[PDB]
Design a protein around this nucleic acid. Structure first.
Lengths: 218, 134, 260
RNA sequence: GAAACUGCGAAUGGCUCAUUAAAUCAGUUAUCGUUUAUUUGAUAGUUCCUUUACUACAUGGUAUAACUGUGGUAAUUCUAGA
RNA sequence: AUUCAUAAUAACUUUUCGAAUCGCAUGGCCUUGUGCUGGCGAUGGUUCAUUCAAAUUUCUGCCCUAUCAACUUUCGAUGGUAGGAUAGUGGCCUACCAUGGUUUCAACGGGUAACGGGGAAUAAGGGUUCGAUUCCGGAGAGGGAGCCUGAGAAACGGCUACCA
């Protein structure tokens, strides 16, 4: 079969072709998320350990966590669950899917490395793939650079320079959750209006009560 | 081509659209026809436009001929006319360009095709191109 | 029908819109609002079917996007707004001050008012209720709600509320002698008096009415609308005055007022 | 400003008349027997703690798509890992 | 016309709500902080009311057939008490109790090549026949049942099972 492993610390991802029957057999009887040391599977992988993440069958049907009985099965499905994109809201739908469990019916299987062995894995361990974004929220930036409540993150922010064909220019995000004098003006508006309207209603009721007093006076 | 008693009936001022709207009544007694652009010229010539704030469009001829009747507008601010009046008359008057767009069913087929592709596409693309390569 | 109707067909529209049989299938379907749609009138209709300031809904909505309107002192930009009785509508760019009221034909009469009296309308009172916190409040025919009114106001009365602040002003009760507008039925548009009331407890109280011509006519209480006192309109009146000509007299007036 | 997330709607409309014989339906009541997105009008000083060494309010937290790139399937508005 | 509105009291609440949201603007006043104030409009939100509706509902009204004269309660048929359930009344459903309910003024059953109505034709009058079909209302989406979403669907150019 083929094996698709990630090195999350680099952000690396890489596929291999693993056609040794004996090394393949090391994974039968296992389920998703179990840990396995790949020493049997390669001296290159000696010391390395991997957590089972997923796999697709020979017709494309995937596995899933906790979906036992290593075979194909139809289940009814919903949102917030993998192997399914609910197309219109409320929709619940039946689909076939392969079991959680390792078996020979998998053209592909995918893992993530838990522990690095002795050797290096060239295409995956060597390269360091960069994260695509930094923080966006002000508090995210604050934790991201170890900043105080006061530190004025605005300048700390990441920017991405981009060339036109020659005209270079930086672009950066738009802080949400940021405190501003506008936000302060907004709470100012709100508070002032609240107590104001309260006292307005108060005096209106006062006038009403006055009228009522005259009515009984008469 | 003897002469033309063109007349402007039913005059309304329209400040909430900034226009003068009226009824055109043409007595074109032995001509043939009307020719809207000639009308456009005589109408800026008698109210004030610099033609292009004037719109005209229901110009049917009487049975027997010699007379035609339509609706006429003269707007304030040719720019204001160019923002309020619709585009088919502007292209008819050459004061705009009719867009070359596709047929309805072609657009619909296109929509129904794009009704399948979640998302950007260009990552659908790099993988349909690799898997297709092999 | 699994849900409400976001459409309206022609030939189901109110006959008092004076539309045509033709020009299409469908019709404007007035939006939610104060005035019930059969009781109401759309902006497009007041414009395009009563003013002729425009032709198409395109032009109408363009105008409303220009915010050319206030309505009871407020802009409303929905083409399908339900305008209706005793509304106040004013235009700025033309400086027209309208107020909505029927003909004696029950047709929403184009009654132009002044800049003043576009500063006041009426509200006939649907219910007055001891709202919560012990609060008293009250509502009107035109979908509003007010608190701390004059308590001597009671059900079926009307009030001269101002317009934009709200703010009830002096008001009119219901007892013998008063002046009235009619707001539904065969006597619709008519104007007259209180001459007696046939109170039928349990439901459908009626009011005997007498116009200026001593034409008597009796109507449902709910279609009653006090408008001031006899010989004392609190507002400006359209032509016709709810006087309810015969077709004979109408004809006579046609051929007579025709000529010179 | 593609794309996607979010929000709304998709229950309208249009087509047909198989069922249906006090059933639907017409006219006429009623809700002091109920719900009501939306529209419109109004509508919110109190939210804390055994009440001095208090508690982000200049605003507090992740969890994810869109995205990356690893991929699978004879085949689909299939979708997996990171 | 109400145990209405509403208030107050004592408690209850896997505690509802009470704006950590967005666009134009820029003002003031000093104790000179970035001070504290401060407009326009955008979207949301409790309750009430309104509107758009919906749901049940009163009364009267339908073609033929007695070669259908008896029907209704197995297992709710009629009603009562209590309860649940419902947006909510209600045998709607469930418990205990009763034995009632309809019927020649035609029930019940059967037929209908029966969706109803607005209306169409016909023309003295009285009537007769038709009305699926440009409006209203209702039902259905191959036949049936179920169901999430949502204010609103038993949705079907949404889903689930069966049958064809």
């Amino acid at each position: 079969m083929k094996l698709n492993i990630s090195y999350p610390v680099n952000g690396s991802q890489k596929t291999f072709e693993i056609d040794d029957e004996h090394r393949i057999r090391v994974f039968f009887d296992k389920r998703i998320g179990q840990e396995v040391d790949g020493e049997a599977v390669g001296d290159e992988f000696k010391g390395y350990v991997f957590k089972i993440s997923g796999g697709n069958d020979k017709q494309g049907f995937p596995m899933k966590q906790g979906v036992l009985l290593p075979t194909r099965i139809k289940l009814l499905l919903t949102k917030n669950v993998s192997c399914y994109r609910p197309r219109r809201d409320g929709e619940r739908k039946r689909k076939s899917v392969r079991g959680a469990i390792v078996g020979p019916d998998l053209a592909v299987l995918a893992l993530v490395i838990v522990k690095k062995g002795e050797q290096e894995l060239e295409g995956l361990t060597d390269t360091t793939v960069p994260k695509r974004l930094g923080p966006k929220r002000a508090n995210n930036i604050r934790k991201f650079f170890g900043l105080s409540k006061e530190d004025d993150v605005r300048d700390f922010v990441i920017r991405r320079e981009v060339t036109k064909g020659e005209k270079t220019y930086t672009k950066a995000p738009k802080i949400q959750r940021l405190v501003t004098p506008q936000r302060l003006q907004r709470k100012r508006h709100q508070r002032a209006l609240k107590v104001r309207n309260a006292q307005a209603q108060r005096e209106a009721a006062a006038e009403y009560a006055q009228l009522l007093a005259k009515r009984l006076s008469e | 081509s003897d002469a033309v008693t063109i007349r402007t009936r039913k005059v309304i001022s329209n400040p909430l659209l900034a226009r003068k709207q009226f009824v055109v009544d043409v007595l074109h007694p032995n001509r043939a026809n009307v020719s809207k652009d000639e009308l456009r010229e005589k109408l800026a010539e008698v109210y004030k436009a610099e033609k292009d704030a004037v719109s005209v469009f229901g110009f049917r001829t009487q049975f027997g001929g010699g007379k035609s009747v339509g609706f006429g507008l003269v707007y304030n601010s040719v720019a204001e006319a160019k923002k309020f009046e619709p585009t088919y008359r502007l292209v008819r008057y050459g004061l705009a360009e009719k867009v070359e767009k596709a047929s309805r069913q072609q657009r619909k087929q296109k929509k129904n095709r794009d009704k399948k592709i979640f998302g950007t596409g260009k990552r659908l693309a790099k993988k349909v191109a690799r898997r297709n390569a092999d | 029908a699994r849900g409400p109707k976001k459409h309206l067909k022609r030939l189901a529209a109110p006959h008092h819109w004076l539309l045509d049989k033709l020009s299409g299938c469908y019709a404007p379907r007035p939006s939610a609002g104060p005035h019930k749609l059969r009781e109401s009138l759309p902006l497009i209709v007041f414009l395009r079917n009563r003013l002729k300031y425009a032709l198409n809904g395109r032009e109408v909505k363009a105008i409303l996007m220009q915010r050319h309107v206030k309505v009871d002192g407020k802009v409303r930009t929905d083409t399908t707004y339900p305008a209706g009785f005793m509304d106040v509508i004013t235009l700025d760019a033309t400086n027209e001050n309208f107020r909505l009221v029927y003909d004696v034909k029950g047709r929403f009469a184009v009654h132009r008012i002044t800049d003043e009296e576009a500063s006041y309308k009426l509200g006939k009172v649907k219910k007055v209720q001891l709202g919560k916190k012990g609060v008293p409040y009250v509502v009107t025919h035109d979908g509003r709600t007010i608190r701390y009114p004059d308590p001597n106001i009671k059900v079926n009365d009307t009030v001269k509320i101002d317009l934009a602040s709200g703010k009830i002003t002096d008001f009119i009760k219901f007892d013998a002698g008063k002046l009235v507008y009619v707001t539904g039925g065969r006597n619709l548009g008519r104007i007259g008096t209180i001459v007696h009331k046939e109170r039928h407890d349990g439901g459908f109280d009626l009011v005997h009415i007498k116009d200026s011509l001593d034409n008597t006519f009796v109507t449902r209480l709910n279609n009653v609308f006090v408008i001031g006192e006899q010989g004392k309109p609190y507002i400006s009146l359209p032509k016709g005055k709810g006087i309810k000509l015969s077709i004979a007299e109408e004809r006579d007036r046609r051929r007579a007022q025709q000529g010179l």
